[PDB]
């Protein structure tokens, strides 16, 4: 009765915490990836570009 | 002495050691004390590739200066030799340089001739 009303509401607010909790931890993983990759594609851009200009230099000097 | 003008510029050599404490002024006499079986040469070469004036604290740079070196040893091992060469071509600053080479195997005496010749 009133017994089951309180039991519902008690369980229901816990439901609301599980669902959001998993989700945000998923999104943060998702967003970690976006950063992780971005810094890598940048890092290999950097290195190759310098090794390009400098490479041509050694040729130019030849 | 009257003809000499006091030093006043310095370069960035890329190692703090010098570049903070001691300050490698242009046209200086710097001896680097080492022992055998220590990294004598390497460290020298580093300087050769990072040596550069500072326009930032002035108004004058390498837009007003090129750069160059003259190297000689006076006999060395072989192992030091080639090792040396590969850092001039990969910098490529070899062109603008002069090499005197006596290898440690020629008649000994020409140890005392050679410095001056280059100098």
UniProtKB/Swiss-Prot annotation, chain A:
This is V-type ATP synthase subunit E. Produces ATP from ADP in the presence of a proton gradient across the membrane. Belongs to the V-ATPase E subunit family. It comes from the Bacteria.
Curated annotation (Swiss-Prot), chain B:
Belongs to the ATPase alpha/beta chains family. Produces ATP from ADP in the presence of a proton gradient across the membrane. The V-type beta chain is a regulatory subunit. This is V-type ATP synthase beta chain. The lineage of its organism: Bacteria, Thermotogati, Deinococcota, Deinococci, Thermales. The gene is atpB. The chain holds residues 121 to 239 of 478 of the full protein.
